[PDB]
Design a protein around this ligand. Structure first.
Ligand code: JJG
Ligand code: JJG
Lengths: 304, 304
């Protein structure tokens, strides 16, 4: 029993982290096979970052300008290319610790683990969610760029995020591993404001199911609702609309607990309208939205 | 910027996890050098667990009754001994992935990472604290016993916890790596009730400092207090007494922020007396106590 905000074990990703230096900028890269992936802004001076022309800055860079260090050993760069907002540095050595892997682009509401790194060395691992406004709420200091977000399926690491920047509001923006930003963000030091940070409703419902499975049940009420009625309440409270696809994904948790999805929606509706009245659910005084239905099943069933 | 509940990177510990089976009981062991450490209740039938005599049960066990599997490869057991509530299985092979390590016994209020494992395979990593009642609030299903808690200092893993049992209240109890339980708990299926789960005051103050460093400052007030006055409030709210040792440990955070420790105590006093009034601090609607002063400095400074 118990329910914790749990990250994937980080060892497979730890084995992939390297330091990339270009001139005076050092950040992190991801070494998979004979390619090192890193944010393209590694080529920028803090001056360049106000309005960088990346193609023009890169003309001034040779293979030997990218210094790649894996532990205390230098890798030989034998090619480089820019794919969207990432650089791919071809090295002469395949990473011997390369796990089975994929590159995936996640949808808002999806959770993943971040291995926060500095100078190619891991500092910590935490769980977070792609917010509906395509930001994440991370913990990143200068030097953390190129840190990655991932999910694991048994022995296959799916990489979904590489860290690139902090908005003036202290929320985080980044790319998939093909270098495409999540949301409308660009790798430039400009005014970039995030949109509404709505609550990920299907994840709150998943976590309420986790609560019931773990014996936190005070919030279960006598009511039900409809998807349309619930959705009127969701819109009022800046919650994401609930779809039938979300209802279907919650089916296994509904089945385990015997609480119909729409009844749990009616419990959620009362919590929104009434507040928690100083009570907690799974040690939280707010409704947690960074567990997916898949996360709750995985944790509640003990998948390795 | 940002502040996350962050676990240590788990790779060094992942390399140490093995499956231990005795008869029909499978749980996790920790393989360091040529010794595998696991809970002694691996020798018990669910029947034995009501009133086990471990010395008598162990007489019936030979080296060949302990099946130790590291990945898909069997280890040869060449000796076994019982140290308090752990078994030490001597194997014929030193773990080649043995990190630099220590065994430490932590104090209540200290935080550590747990690598939750099943059948010797890692499922997840999370951060938690030794509660003042010597329980922890984990996420452990059947088969998770022998999962370990640890801290890392650069390249040295300090192991502080091995998981042994769940109390009837769904909180967790375990040992240090010499097999001594934290608190008064025993490895028997009996009535064992936990004492008061007080709040770890020095950790709340550390997290309020983290909040100020990260720009969450609404709760800063115009007041100060004394250690005696604060402590009268702490006792009323089931907070641990604050000592001058705690004040001294908060000194670096006081210095960074320019907020005297006793002024932050006065802010905490007002939050206790007034509540949060529907506001949040670092995305929490309650006062978080599972970050130590050392954790806040580590995260806020980017140690690897
Ligand atoms: C993010 C990162 C990688 C992928 S793999 C599919 C992408 N393709 C395949 C390779 O050419 C470019 C487009 C998906 C999402
Ligand atoms: C917990 C686990 C191990 C230690 S090392 C010091 C313990 N000693 C040394 C070995 O003999 C038994 C006593 C400390 C706390």
């Amino acid at each position: 029993s118990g329910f914790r905000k749990m990250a994937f074990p980080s060892g497979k990703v730890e084995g992939c982290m390297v330091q990339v230096t270009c001139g005076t900028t050092t950040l992190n890269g991801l070494w998979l096979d004979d390619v090192v992936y890193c944010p393209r802004h590694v080529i920028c001076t803090s001056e360049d970052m106000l309005n960088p022309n990346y193609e023009d800055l890169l003309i001034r860079k040779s293979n030997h300008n990218f210094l790649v260090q894996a532990g205390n050993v230098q890798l030989r760069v034998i090619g480089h290319s820019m794919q969207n907002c990432v650089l791919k540095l071809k090295v002469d050595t395949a990473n011997p610790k390369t796990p089975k892997y994929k590159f995936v682009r996640i949808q808002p509401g999806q959770t993943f683990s971040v291995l926060a790194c500095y100078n190619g060395s891991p500092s910590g691992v935490y769980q977070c969610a792609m917010r509906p406004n395509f930001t994440i709420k991370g913990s990143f200091l200068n030097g953390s760029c190129g840190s990655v977000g991932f999910n694991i399926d048994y022995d296959c690491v799916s990489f979904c995020y590489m860290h690139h920047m902090e908005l003036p509001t202290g929320v985080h923006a980044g790319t998939d591993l093909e270098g495409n930003f999540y949301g409308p963000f660009v790798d430039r030091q400009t005014a970039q404001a995030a949109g509404t940070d709505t609550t990920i409703t299907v994840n709150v419902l998943a976590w309420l199911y986790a609560a019931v499975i773990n014996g936190d049940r005070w919030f279960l009420n006598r009511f039900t609702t409809t998807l349309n009625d619930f959705n009127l309440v969701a819109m009022k409270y800046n919650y994401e609309p609930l779809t039938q696809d979300h209802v279907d994904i919650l089916g296994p948790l509904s089945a385990q607990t015997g609480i119909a999805v729409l009844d749990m929606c009616a419990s959620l509706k009362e919590l929104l309208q009434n507040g928690m009245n100083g009570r907690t659910i799974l040690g939280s005084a707010l409704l947690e939205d960074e567990f997916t239905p898949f996360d709750v099943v995985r944790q509640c069933s003990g998948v390795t």
